[PDB]
Amino acid sequence: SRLNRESVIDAALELLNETGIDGLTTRKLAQKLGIEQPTLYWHVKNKRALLDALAVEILARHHDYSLPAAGESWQSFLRNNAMSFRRALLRYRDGAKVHLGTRPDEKQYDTVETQLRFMTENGFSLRDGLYAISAVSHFTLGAVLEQQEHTAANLPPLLREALQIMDSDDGEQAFLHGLESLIRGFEVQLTALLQIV
Amino acid sequence: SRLNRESVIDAALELLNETGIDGLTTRKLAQKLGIEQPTLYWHVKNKRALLDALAVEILARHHDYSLPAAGESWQSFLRNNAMSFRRALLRYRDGAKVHLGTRPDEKQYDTVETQLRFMTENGFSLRDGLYAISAVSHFTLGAVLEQQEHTAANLPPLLREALQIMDSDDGEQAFLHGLESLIRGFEVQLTALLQIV
Numbered sequence A, B: 001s002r003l004n005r006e007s008v009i010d011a012a013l014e015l016l017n018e019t020g021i022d023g024l025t026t027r028k029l030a031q032k033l034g035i036e037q038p039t040l041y042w043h044v045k046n047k048r049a050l051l052d053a054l055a056v057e058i059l060a061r062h063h064d065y066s067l068p069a070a071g072e073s074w075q076s077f078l079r080n081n082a083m084s085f086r087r088a089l090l091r092y093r094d095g096a097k098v099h100l101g102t103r104p105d106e107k108q109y110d111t112v113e114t115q116l117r118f119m120t121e122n123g124f125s126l127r128d129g130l131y132a133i134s135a136v137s138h139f140t141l142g143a144v145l146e147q148q149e150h151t152a153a154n155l156p157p158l159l160r161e162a163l164q165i166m167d168s169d170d171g172e173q174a175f176l177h178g179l180e181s182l183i184r185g186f187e188v189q190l191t192a193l194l195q196i197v
């Protein structure tokens, strides 16, 4: 195929879908593109640079709810942004694993900056707004991971029923439920001000 | 060294600390123990069986707050149990990655069963109690992961300050903060009953 940022990424995405993050090796990428390793090396220097680019690309191509709508509430944003995040993280095999460890990329600077400011101008201190943003991120990541990494791998009464409930759907209900509890818990903090809550 | 469940696990734990979950190969384990691969194979059948055992052992050896104290509140348990969980997950390199994908092991059946019943007899339905337990688990996992996997790998004003705050300590504050918001959010649900909250 052609060898430019976009073509290379597409092949990388398709390859991830087939072999998972572990099967994803520059060697396999070369074959997929129908080229020799030295040709690939000229474009993609290594596995981490390749994965970093993927983490970025996955979000820019599927994470539709990144910036808040006109006059939207901080609660609705956190909910919508979290859902979008989870959605994008699921689009690809090991998607959540690819994202793991990454920090805002330059292209994202704009988007993340805006998220932080939006939270402050709604009553959050940089600290608290950051923490709300973080908790949502950490909660979404772990849920998706435990879901994906689970599928890719004598019981007592309550536990038994628990296990059936956890298979009813692909962890979606439990997530949305936890998401609400998280957002609400943030409310009780914002409105609590300096009072003992 | 000796080759029995405990000696093999110890070597596996020490090895994980040195090479990470990826460097952890049955081949490297054999050398560490000072034995030949076929000797190891007689004991440890494969990487997954080895990792599963580790996930179990890490918790049984460091997760001290697994069952609730006499007459303890569901909020204090969720908080203490979550802290212990995070603590154990940090004790070893890639600890959170080892745990990923695992389900309660037979030895744990007792412990998990008890956690579920304790939540129900405090007003939670199996469903809701499960979800509270899950959200805590998913939140703790993701925080630890993003922390560990981060270390093992032109900025705008707000984002810049945000990044400094996220390095102040090893993600502990942000976690405890999110933990409280999560627990509180669960309260608002329990006491809300059938009323529109």
Ligand SMILES: CN(C)CC(=O)Nc1ccc2c(c1O)C(=O)C1=C(O)[C@]3(O)C(=O)C(C(N)=O)=C(O)[C@@H](N(C)C)[C@@H]3C[C@@H]1C2
Pocket (backbone or CB within 6 Å): A059, A063, A065, A066, A081, A082, A085, A101, A102, A103, A104, A108, A111, A112, A115, A133, A134, A136, A137, B146, B147, B150, B162, B163, B166, B171
């Ligand atoms: C502890 N260590 C990871 C260092 C550290 O905390 N730095 C960080 C400091 C600040 C951030 C960080 C990290 O890692 C992110 O990774 C964010 C996202 O991925 C994003 O989803 C993020 O990048 C985007 C996005 N591009 O749209 C989001 O939608 C945010 N929501 C909450 C899902 C989220 C914003 C985070 C900002």
Ligand SMILES: CN(C)CC(=O)Nc1ccc2c(c1O)C(=O)C1=C(O)[C@]3(O)C(=O)C(C(N)=O)=C(O)[C@@H](N(C)C)[C@@H]3C[C@@H]1C2
Pocket (backbone or CB within 6 Å): A146, A147, A150, A162, A163, A166, A171, B059, B063, B065, B066, B081, B082, B085, B101, B102, B103, B104, B108, B111, B112, B115, B133, B134, B136, B137
């Ligand atoms: C979606 N998929 C993973 C399937 C599924 O959800 N099954 C599951 C169904 C039910 C559970 C599950 C999974 O995976 C656990 O993994 C739990 C723990 O690891 C534990 O930390 C857990 O094993 C222990 C423990 N042994 O002490 C804990 O302390 C619990 N707290 C909340 C940290 C937690 C209980 C979970 C029960």
Ligand SMILES: [Mg+2]
Pocket (backbone or CB within 6 Å): A099, A102, A103, A137
């Ligand atoms: Mg991230």
Ligand SMILES: [Mg+2]
Pocket (backbone or CB within 6 Å): B099, B102, B103, B137
């Ligand atoms: Mg688990």
